[PDB]
Ligand binder design. Structure first.
Ligand code: ASP
Ligand code: ASP
Lengths: 437, 508, 437, 508
């Protein structure tokens, strides 16, 4: 209601104006620059920035006079150097931009914030990395971890494989935070025979806030791209304070918190190491793939007609009939406890196997391992031919099944593959110090 | 009868007032309780931000260079993620918002139709997120006064910063309990043209605040800052004005200070001395003081210190000239010098402190001073001494120009003291986490009609309606016992005298 | 195939026999009592229990001679006294049996394990509780938590109030491990205006193995029944050791691990208090409901046509659509990060809302607080009328919605309801010592 | 040449052997690595389980009443939830299994078609789950011998308990590393009728296990037990028999001890004594020792101790009779007595130990002893001496009847010493978590063919095939070089003497 009205009286966003309005019978006079409407609301209100910087709101109906003093002083549209002159004797690490922003410029006068992925920007914004390696920013695509599909993971693997095999010492993927753990699991299975560091990294606090965890995460991540660890890892704060990051093995990481930096944790397995922006490192494990010269081989194949179904008291078999019915080849059921399902639903699962669907079992209890022999319900799910996925993260098992169904459609074979340990995905046994950490 | 004809001297005064609301923290359902229990701690570092065109704020950049870390103290019960910067804020807290609105109307302000929150950037580390969430809530209010109406351009509701526990070098420790407590800021306009008028605005606003009866009461809970000026002087920010009753004398003493400085500058201009005539060359005089009887200098030397001089052309009898009762131009010099040194000696104040005429003439000589030229000493390690003498030179220079813009603090004297340089303009930007808050016309009205009665309006009523004696009426109010008093009578009880007397007098 | 083959030759399970079979031409002969066939593993093998007590397998095929030496001794059959004479002064406590066995007898010469629930059996197994209060076991229904449903959370809530109002000092409910945190949240909303302690309790380790956690949990449970705490709680081990148990407020409790006693954790709030079988108690908070005379009022109202949906990279909006078409009244979405869904799906949600469906947003990361105002995707979901459920547990939100809908269909009301704190579910603010704890 | 006509006596010898397999833990993919690194510890209690008809096993109830708490030590890398009773078991381990299947054929035993696991309950606390997982794998195997064939009824693949570390009171500490390591149990049949026949069967099995070259060659890793009996004797469990060469003698020192004990029981029957004829009455002969040159007793008294005696009708000249070289029926008394007192004194051993003959006769009086009546003295704290003597009573009576069916431990001499009563029958119940494992004829065949080479057989092939010294052939295998040599010659190299001479000779 205001967008048009403004235009009607011939006004442009940014024009310096002087509004007069009525409030409880009497005149109130303002003077500011017309600002854009709230990112999500029809307006019976107009936004005006005063010569204070303070944004104010005015109700249309109350506006009696809205003169224009100065007009939209639109300007420049500055540009930055994509890549920058490297340094002698420093590794080449290419930062594949997946959409997760690691820096940003903010126009105070305008109040707008623009992402930043240009080397000339990452330089002034985050110098630290350039005294560790020659950073090569590579725009793959701007996307939110929220709406990212398997196909994207693929476009990632290649670009990593490429740059990596194209001489780069290590790669660093700047992904969004919401889905990072899914992505991580993806590349893990995709980058077959890897001999160099692959690092997913993002910020919990937006790049613009002085308190962003973006910087430290980047530094730590690059120092790792530069490490002797030959596998896909996620590098995020380890604690809440600016201390050290943790490098988790990309098949045992889950976002465990809605907004904290501690958000990412290793599950059912220990992290790989602690890194400090400072440079010191501390492996927490000895069994990690080491640096080599082997060429990374991307493995595309993935059947994405697979769904993840979380069980709960009161689910109807209809939810599963529907899936079989719409031609889903795989179902990763994230069930209850040791890996159970309500018995009133074991038949719809029994039927999904008969229709040659791959049904995998994991548990809603993020930590722990699935074992279907103990209790009767489990044995029943076993008979129906359900595939127990040991201690594999429910999200990881989802990604995995797609990949594995992208190789076979034969269940006996899907069993072996699922249960085969290509990455840290599964564990021989559960360590006591592997829970709630 | 005033001291100066404040109309001739273009006296301009402004008022800035911060006050905490006794509500929950502004952006999280947390008790605005303070606690000396620190159960855990976390360390953090803040980092500047590029401008639309890759620039880094010098100040914030400068602070980055100091390589200091911010340690924050908090307890498991009063510290939430929002004030740890580990969860998005929610707000503003409705109670605080309304109290703001109320205060607005109560001050003839016109509340905004829709509120938008800003992020004022903050370097200190006193704000864990790097910024202070602020917002304008009302505008163009006004306080009537004997000298004419004074305006209130802005009323804002913002977050107060964390408490500082210690500023070690390369590590400032802050406590989180205070971070988030709602703050209402009320700002005058640079037109108050009389000391008294100031106290009046200051007092009215203070009272509007008491009225709301949900504004924190206590020690460090009220900020009354002034900004004085004179035709041909300079805008001087005066922090820490303790009690309302000092406002008139402080403003008066300041006008005096500035008035005198100008008189001095004029004498200087007349003698003809330009800032360039004050060369930053330091004469080593540690010799003329090898065997002096000044305990001060003597110790400095024995520890390996030096006595450097400074030649200040035509500054004689002007360094010792009084600018405020008990303060001289040299007190300003010394003040600025204090950044590196405990004190300074200058030609107008001695012979004294153990320095003989001999020592004085010996210096007048090695510096080749005229009868108009003067000098200024400093006894400390060679470098410190220089930096101090530099700081003094900058001031002697500024002195020939006029009144240096600076932020001074209030003294129990009614005098001011240099404190730091005026703060730079703040950088602000949209707090996109908090949705715009639409203030319904029904809420504004439903609030605008039920405004509390000012404290004085009460004292006056007590005297009319209830007839009780004034001394009783006021004392009931001036000693915050006005709340209870109202309670007794509500019972149709103790008419007024009984109640009033028993309280104000009996229980005392 | 073994079942019938056995009967034919007239062989009763439990009969002492002498069988001979040809193993690799060789001749072998066993003598033992015939046993039941493993849960589910048909034909080809007969199980025999040698006088060693050891169990053996005989491939029917290979059997050449089966002679019955002695018959099935099967006899006695003893019963125990359901309730027993209380001790002077002790409080009355009723243990409602929901199927979560807390004790068992075991026929060593038979190999069978029988669940026990008699007061006599409980005393013979857990003297400790009969010393704290007078325990009255009341068998409501023997069911696995795995397949537990709303109709039950109603029968429980009533059974509880009855006993609670009959004048019992507190109630203890023997539930199963799997679902317990769902039930816990149900009894939290249904048991309106509570004044006495209500305690869910089960054993992670079956209660027949010498190492079980049934006992200590029971013991700590009955002690809490006697607390000054007026709310539904879960009382389980706080660690691996037989140290202390934790009393979790029944709506912030989740089963975080697959099999440890350590399994139940308080998500987003602190437990109510630590308790030792010993009898000692340490409150971890001060704000919990105190005991009172208040009589409990049940509140059955619940629309069980609610689904819980976990979002993952690439979900066809078809799954939300199916739910809508099928006529679901409410949908709780286990979102992403601060509560996101791929934009690729917002539309389907947007419709379900216009279709009068209650859509609530929780979060895949168990800990933390949903907030749809920070990011663009969130703002989208808000504008679509999705009810953001603060820091409520996904499983708790599911249950809270069935209840809230059973009270109204008005979405404006559903908010208030949902966003109104009836028990511990929403938190004023998130404390630092609430994560992974 | 034998010591006795073992055919006349009812010589029945049984044999049981336990051995750790070098695979991963039996019910969890865990490295059977021991470790002295303790990174964390946790507490635990175990409770008895009700019977078919609500009865608590006495032996367990007992342990329970004691109120002991079990502490377990583990290290982050080698300790897993499965042996913490915090995650269901997974097994049996395939290697460990096969190895078992292999050892079974080496013993002509017939494997089972399908394996069912059991749970043997364990009081100790040495098993975190409260039980040890066992399972029969093969039955009726045999070991050919000079005196005839000896049969192997069972061959089991079970779990080894954890390592005891400290037995504080009301608290036992155990180390988990050992828990779960596979264990192979082979049991003979009490049909063995010769001391050397035992060594044969014992040795052979020993070789068969070595043949798998996948067994642990550790210090405390090989458990071998014997249970001996004679006609008119008793089944005695001899635990902890050291080396294979000790078997022959130990089995004889037993046949001897039992043969003499009876030759004593016949003596008693003759003298006509009876179990009831031994009243448990204590005499306070203490005083008679008030003045004794026996430091031993004298110390007791001086510390508030009393000396007590016992009357044993017609036990004179027998208590001091030697049953085994260096041991006499009295020694057996002291052992049972050791349960409460460090030792005892009997009429047939003194005068001695500083006990004057005077003292002896003086005791014969107060208790009135016949020309065949004897006594026993025990200086200890009131009650101690009572219980001690009571235990002496128990045995004494038993002696009149025959051979006490007890469990004795072997000594270096070859004689035995009292330990505890014959263990009670174990209580087991299905191990429900592990599905029944079936052994395909397919796998049975593959394993039955490729059976390994028994040690000796190799020795005998080296001589016969490579024509080398018998001395070298033996010393080549007897010193585990059995592999290195084969590996060397495998190079078509060092014929046999080049290698054999090198290894067995050169090296040394
Ligand atoms: N919505 C954001 C959230 C984040 O990354 O913090 C994303 O792109 O994942
Ligand atoms: N399946 C079991 C799980 C347990 O209680 O541990 C049940 O009955 O719920």
């Amino acid at each position: 209601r205001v967008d048009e009205f403004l235009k009607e009286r011939n006004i442009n966003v940014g024009d310096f104006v002087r509004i007069t309005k009525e409030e409880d019978g009497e005149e109130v006079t303002y003077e500011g620059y017309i600002m854009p409407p709230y990112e999500l609301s029809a307006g019976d209100t107009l936004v005006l920035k005063l010569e204070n910087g303070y944004n104010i709101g005015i109700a249309l109906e109350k506006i009696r006079r809205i003169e224009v003093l100065e007009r939209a002083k639109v300007k420049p549209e500055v540009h930055f150097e994509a890549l920058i002159e490297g340094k002698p004797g420093l590794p080449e690490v290419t930062i594949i931009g997946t959409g997760g922003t690691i820096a940003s410029r903010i126009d105070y006068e305008t109040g707008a914030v623009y992402p930043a992925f240009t080397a000339e920007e990452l330089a002034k914004a985050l110098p630290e990395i350039f005294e560790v390696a020659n950073v090569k920013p590579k725009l793959l695509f701007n996307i939110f971890s929220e709406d990212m599909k398997p196909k994207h993971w693929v476009k990632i693997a290649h670009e990593v494989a490429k740059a990596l095999n194209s001489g780069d010492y290590g790669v660093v993927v700047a992904h969004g935070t919401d889905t990072m753990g899914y992505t991580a699991a993806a590349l893990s299975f995709m980058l077959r025979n890897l001999g160099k560091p692959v690092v997913l990294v993002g910020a919990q606090r937006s790049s613009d806030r002085p308190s962003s965890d973006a910087a430290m995460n980047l530094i730590c991540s690059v120092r790792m791209a530069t490490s002797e660890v030959a596998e896909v890892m996620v590098v995020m704060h380890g604690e809440t304070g600016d201390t050290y990051c943790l490098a988790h093995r990309g098949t045992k990481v889950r976002k465990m918190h809605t907004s904290r930096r501690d958000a990412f944790r290793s599950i059912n397995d220990v992290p790989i190491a602690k890194i400090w922006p400072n440079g010191e490192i501390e492996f927490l494990r000895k069994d990690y793939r080491k640096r080599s010269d082997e060429e990374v081989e991307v493995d595309d194949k993935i059947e994405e007609k697979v769904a993840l179904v979380k069980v709960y008291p009161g689910i109807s078999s209809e939810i599963i009939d529907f899936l079989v019915d719409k031609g889903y080849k795989g179902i990763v059921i994230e069930g209850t406890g040791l890996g159970h399902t309500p018995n009133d639903i074991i038949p719809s699962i029994e039927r999904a196997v008969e229709e040659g669907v791959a049904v995998c079992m994991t548990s809603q209890c993020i930590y722990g391992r699935v074992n279907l022999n103990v209790y009767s319900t489990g044995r029943k799910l076993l008979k129906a031919g359900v595939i127990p996925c040991e201690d594999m993260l429910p999200e990881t098992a989802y990604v995995k099944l797609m990949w594995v169904l992208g190789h076979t459609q034969n269940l006996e074979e899907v069993r072996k593959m699922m249960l085969t340990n290509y990455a840290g995905e599964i564990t021989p046994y559960t360590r006591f110090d592997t829970y709630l950490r | 009868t005033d001291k100066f004809n404040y109309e001739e001297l273009g006296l301009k005064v402004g008022l800035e007032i911060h006050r905490q609301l006794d509500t929950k923290k502004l952006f999280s359902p947390v008790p605005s309780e303070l606690s000396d229990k620190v159960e855990f701690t976390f360390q953090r570092r803040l980092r500047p931000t590029m401008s639309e065109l890759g620039e880094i704020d010098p100040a914030a950049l400068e602070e980055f260079k100091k390589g200091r870390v911010y340690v924050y103290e908090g307890n498991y019960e009063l510290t939430d993620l929002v004030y740890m910067d580990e969860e998005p804020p929610r707000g503003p807290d409705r109670e605080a918002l309304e109290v703001a609105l109320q205060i607005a109307y109560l001050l003839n302000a016109k509340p905004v139709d829709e509120v938008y929150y800003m992020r004022k950037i903050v370097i200190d580390g006193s704000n864990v997120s790097g910024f202070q969430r602020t917002a304008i809530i009302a505008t163009d209010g006004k306080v009537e006064t004997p000298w004419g109406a004074v305006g209130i351009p802005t009323i804002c509701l913002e977050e107060d910063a964390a408490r500082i526990i210690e500023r070690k070098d390369k590590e400032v420790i802050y406590r989180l309990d205070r971070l988030g407590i709602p703050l209402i800021e009320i700002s005058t306009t640079p037109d108050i043209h009389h000391p008294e008028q100031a106290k009046v605005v200051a007092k009215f606003i203070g009272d509007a605040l008491r009225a709301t009866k949900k504004v924190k009461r206590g020690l460090g809970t009220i900020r009354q800052d002034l900004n004085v000026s004179i035709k041909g002087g300079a805008r001087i920010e005066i922090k820490g004005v303790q009690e309302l009753d000092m406002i008139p004398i402080i403003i008066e003493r300041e006008v005096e200070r500035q008035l005198n400085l100008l008189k001095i500058r004029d004498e200087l201009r007349k003698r003809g001395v330009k800032p360039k005539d004050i060369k930053e060359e330091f004469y080593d005089v540690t010799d003329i003081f090898e065997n002096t009887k000044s305990k001060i200098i003597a110790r400095v030397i024995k520890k390996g210190g030096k006595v450097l001089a400074i030649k200040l052309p035509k500054f004689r009898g002007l360094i010792g000239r009084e600018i405020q009762p008990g303060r001289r131009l040299g007190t300003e010099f010394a003040d600025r010098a204090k950044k590196y040194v405990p004190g300074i000696f200058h030609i107008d104040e001695l012979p004294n402190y153990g320095i003989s005429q001999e020592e004085v003439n010996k210096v007048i000589e090695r510096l080749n001073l005229s009868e108009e030229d003067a000098f200024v000493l400093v006894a400390a390690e060679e470098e410190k001494a220089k930096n101090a003498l530099r700081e003094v030179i900058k001031r002697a220079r500024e002195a020939i120009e006029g009144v240096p813009e600076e932020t001074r603090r209030a003294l129990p004297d009614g005098n001011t003291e240099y404190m730091r340089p005026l703060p730079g303009k703040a950088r602000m930007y949209p707090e996109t986490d908090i949705p715009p808050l639409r203030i319904p016309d029904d809420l504004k009205k439903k609030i605008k009609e039920n405004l509390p009665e000012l404290p004085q309006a009460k004292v006056e009523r007590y005297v009319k309606e209830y007839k009780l004696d004034r001394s009783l009426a006021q004392t009931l109010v001036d000693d915050e016992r006005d709340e209870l008093f109202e309670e007794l009578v509500s019972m149709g009880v103790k008419p007024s005298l009984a109640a009033s007397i028993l309280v104000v007098v009996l229980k005392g």
